[PDB]
Amino acid sequence: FKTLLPVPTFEDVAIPEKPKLRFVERVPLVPKVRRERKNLSDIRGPSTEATEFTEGRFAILALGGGYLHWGHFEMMRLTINRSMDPKNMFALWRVPAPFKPITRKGMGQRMGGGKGAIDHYVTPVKAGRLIVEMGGRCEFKEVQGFLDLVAHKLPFPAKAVSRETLEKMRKDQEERERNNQNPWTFERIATANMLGIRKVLSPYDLTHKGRYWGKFYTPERV
Amino acid sequence: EALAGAPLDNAPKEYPPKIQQLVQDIASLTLLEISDLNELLKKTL
Amino acid sequence: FKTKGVLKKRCRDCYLVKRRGRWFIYCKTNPKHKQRQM
Amino acid sequence: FREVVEILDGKTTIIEGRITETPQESPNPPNPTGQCPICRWNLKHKYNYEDVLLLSQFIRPHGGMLPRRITGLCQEEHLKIEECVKMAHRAGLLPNHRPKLPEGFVPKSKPRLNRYLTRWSPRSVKPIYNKGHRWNKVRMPVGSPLLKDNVSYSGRPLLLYH
Amino acid sequence: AAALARLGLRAVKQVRVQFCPFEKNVESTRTFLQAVSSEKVRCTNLNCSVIADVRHDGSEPCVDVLFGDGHRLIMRGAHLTAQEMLTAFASHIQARG
Amino acid sequence: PPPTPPQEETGLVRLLRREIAAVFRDNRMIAVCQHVALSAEDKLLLRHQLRKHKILMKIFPNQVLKPFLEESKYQNLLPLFVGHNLLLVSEEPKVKEMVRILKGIPFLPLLGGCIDDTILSRQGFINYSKL
Amino acid sequence: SGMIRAIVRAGQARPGPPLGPILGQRGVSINQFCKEFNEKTKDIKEGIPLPTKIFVKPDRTFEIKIGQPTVSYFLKAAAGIEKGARHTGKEVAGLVTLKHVYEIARVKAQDDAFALQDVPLSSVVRSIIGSARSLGIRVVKDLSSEELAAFQKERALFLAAQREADLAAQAEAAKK
Amino acid sequence: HAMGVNIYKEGQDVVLKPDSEYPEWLFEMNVGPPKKLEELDPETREYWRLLRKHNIWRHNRLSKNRKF
């Protein structure tokens, strides 16, 4: 004998037309003819843009930083389009098209001579940026089950997250930070310049607070 | 209250005390009351 | 056998056993599911 | 303690269960409000592999272990008991709890190698042929990480990998 | 229930289960009776007869089987558990006959 | 331990409680049986053969049965309800045609029961049947 | 040796499919079953399909038991339609009253599955209404004055709907 | 077979009894909307049957990712 439990009933969920993921382009319709410098600050540091949900209730959260290109976009599009139900699910891109060009020199020739030819296009993704946001009238478990295969094959580490899971790990980070037992922390050392640590540390580390080093983000850092 | 203890056939010897007290209440009566009792029982059953 | 990095059951009759310090998928009905962690 | 007796008397098999008197718990624990048997007797972070008198309490006569539903222990301390019983068994303690097979004691082998604090099994460890330098060293584990929470009277941590 | 069904109990002739339901130590006997009286065990062979004797003051929970190796297995389950009774029953009655 | 959280009885639990109260109130014959897994055809034929003389049968979970029958006047039936069980239900008790069913199949035990606020055994049911 | 569930029409029992490969796989003679089925069924002149249980035996003989007919043919004969609804819920198949469902409830009260059940007539009328929920025929409590106008409208409406469906099917077959 | 129901053919195809012969409970039950979870009383066995059916629906939706 066991006791029954109430099922979550979703009556306010509206499925928009064309619930599948929109097809993205290899190259944007206007090509960039000017070759610009490869900024790494679009990978470095925490994400500021599109860190929150808009319509859907599930997402792919990026724990690390990195570049996404047309192979990864086709991967996500094909995998979600064959693994979801169009009647019960809708999906949405939270990332733009590949717009930053990445160039290559014709391999085998010497260093110098100038810039190379434009090879492909990528999108920079920081840590904490949502990639694909999904909504529907069903639970998180099957959505997590088919989104972990998508999130595993991405370059940066990634997770299948919900609204409750994202707030759970965020307030977990806050309670760990306010339940620090040692009196010495990265903020107190770096902002006050303790032991002349700014000679070794970066000026970006005052904002990063030691949780970010390059493109790598460690959530256990506090 | 509580129910009976349900004795079994291995050592059945305990008759209910209600039966014995009804037998004694019958046996403490005269024959005019025997006839009245028999008439009142024949009328009911 | 198949030597693998992560182990999973390809059917419900497979079982986990720790032998010789390593983890084993052993299956009786389908012997093709025999897998060994590396 | 219940034992089963199987009797063969002329194509008739009789299987019976008999109760033998069992020892009881000691009357006065020092910490009566504790739930768990170790954690109410204040032996948490105290016992080791050497404590034979306590490891003999939660074991079978054939060297087996009793389940946690019977023993009543908390899960981490049950795992600590299991690791310490395994360590004592490979260390050569509890000699009377081996099973009896009289045909097998007579064919002697090479003498038993004296050992203690064995986290792993003797038969499943590969020899470290390659070893390593100081900047990458393959360290032989001695003792178990489940027992790092014991008290340190010297104050130094217990070196588990050497 | 499945262990007796897989093992081919067609070599068994007679089963009887004599118990007193008003006692406290007969639940293993009831579980063993429900194991030997399940559907697959019953349809393993139709020539085996099972008897469920119910008493009150018999004061002995017991099971007794006869099978055609000349053998009669009688075991009084009062302190025995149902798994022990099933294991001993199978490991005797399939090894003999 | 922390202080005990008070578990709330739900609508299903209360519905089964008043169902047990009703079947123990209005009926004259309540019989206990050791429930045996049968063929499903044999089960439904058994239901029809009990419909032939108006006796019904239910299964009630012991999780909601045992405390109610421990507070009730039928506390002596608790050793018959430790294991798997079945409840036989009659208005107007007549037990020749029920024991005729229970002797036609040899492996459905009759453990006990209560007829007219008196608790009887299987041999007591047999004597009450011949009476 | 096994069980076969076969829905066979009343006056047509033939030594061919689906009775051929199903019953001939068991090793049972088809002509003997056809003769006995025709003999048992020929007293019913209604022309109604029957679900039948064939218990094929290990000695290659057979036993036959006849049950009550199908809810689909019952409600199709009650509503006067030849086929069921293509899209259940988007459209209605037919219109009947409660008297058809109640009569079908008394007919199916002697079925092999439900006569062995002890359930009342409310259970079987709920079963037939629940079958109608997927079969597409919607019942009405009291339509007896209104069902004349309802049939007079709905026959013309469903004639237009069937003509449009046939035209769409012909256009789809031409474009495919 | 094919049969068309008319003014005479809908009443002569069967035995059309008066409404007073018929009970109350065929008129009692609903026709077109199935009962939902919020409508039914919580102390009704049909409510718990509907909740159990929703639980099997939830379990079937959860078990769509089976690897076996």
Place this chain on the structure above:
RNA sequence: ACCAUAGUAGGCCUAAAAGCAGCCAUCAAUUGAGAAAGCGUUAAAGCUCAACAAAUUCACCAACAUAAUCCCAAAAACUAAU
């Protein structure tokens, strides 16, 4: 571990679509069981899950080979250490 019986080949298309190439409904029996969550068939048949009833120690993710002359201080889990 334990157990699986009802309308019912739910309605269309199709040579066949019997829970299960596809589309639409997703009702209704028995305390108990989804017009069916996985295997299987040409179509079936059949084997499993959920549901009763029997009980209940805990159960969310995590583990991943290698090079060439000969491996590379020896070794140590507790006598008190800001």
